[model samples]
Target: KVFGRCELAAAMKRHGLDNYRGYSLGNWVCAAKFESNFNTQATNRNTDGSTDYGILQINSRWWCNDGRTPGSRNLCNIPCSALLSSDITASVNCAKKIVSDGNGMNAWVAWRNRCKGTDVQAWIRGCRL
Candidate 1:
């Protein structure tokens, strides 16, 4: 599923991302905008043979097991394919773990380069969250 901006914002907020790890819901919405344009099935392969999966682009190298990543830790204890589900349970849960592990939202380069240090509220301004 491909989420519209407001849809993604509301969904993230519903899942407790509003102030997770001190980052606002807008910050997560903004990062999702850049990471996968709100698409649930988005995937990207890194040069190191690791693949990033789903909307938030969680990586196979450390988060999920794809069986193809060179050195996967599968810390999330789920298959990488789980992240591609439109349900988003696995994706959101793994994302929370990533942030709670001290990576904050900086685990995603798109968030760091585009959403960080910016007025993230604008990303959710017109949303009904």
Candidate 2:
């Protein structure tokens, strides 16, 4: 499926992140791409039985308790499948809330650090929304 930049802009606007300077949608997308190749359904199995799922690679089991269903944990309840369904902007916003709480841009910085010396930040800068 194709993910639209306008949709992402709308989602960011809904989350009151329209003034993003250090944490733009481009930064968010870069983080997601680095983490899970922008695959919302992605899941990573940890050695301690923990699993990180979704585009942001959220640990649904930790955030949602595996049986609570969607919409149960404020922002954390966002389902991996739904995040992968459509509107990547929504998924990005949801993940951003969980990761940064609209303040912490460190998460994005960390992602950039992981791919240091590359044009990751530039790529994010090129993103429209």
Candidate 3:
């Protein structure tokens, strides 16, 4: 089945994360499942909202500006709705360019380590394509 826009966005966000040089969604989802149970809306009260959001658990404020509004388009200087629109590939690619200078997955892996944690590297080993 074809993934929905939200689902694809989450997957892209996870795979194209801004950490580890070569990590992808396939690498992190397994860990995400363990951490957040695959819940995109999951939030940790213990950390005071310090980590993870959405299917990829993207920290809205950290990466972009969706906190003011769940789907606000003004946070990253782009429309959040645009980011979340049906053109998921375009959105993912746009986000990838913003974070990785068009390096996309490579840049994501690097940033993921810097922001999320270093342990994510082990997951990178499992990334496919």
Best by TM-score: 1
* Alpha carbon lDDT of each predicted model: 0.91, 0.53, 0.42
Two-way lDDT contest, 2 vs 3, winner: 2
* Poorest lDDT segment (10 consecutive residues) of candidate 1: 97-106
lDDT of 3 by residue, 1-129 (tens): 224333543555655553445654544443444434544445443234333333333444445454553433332354333443333443444455444544343233324444355454454343343
- Output the lDDT of residue 114, model 2: 58
Off by over 4 Å in 3: 1-21, 45-52, 67-129
Task: Spell out the clash pairs found in candidate 2.
Answer: 40-55
Off by over 4 Å in 1: none
Give residue 96's error in model 2 in angstroms: 3.7
TM-scores, each model vs. reference: 0.96, 0.57, 0.36
| Model 1 vs. true fold: TM | 0.96
Task: Report the lDDT tens digits of candidate 1 across residue range 26-77.
Answer: 9998998999999999999889899989999999999999999988899999
- Higher-scoring candidate on TM-score, 1 or 2: 1
In model 1, the clashing pairs are: none
TM-score of 2: 0.57
Stretch of 10 with least lDDT, candidate 3 = 45-54
Cα TM-score of candidate 3: 0.36
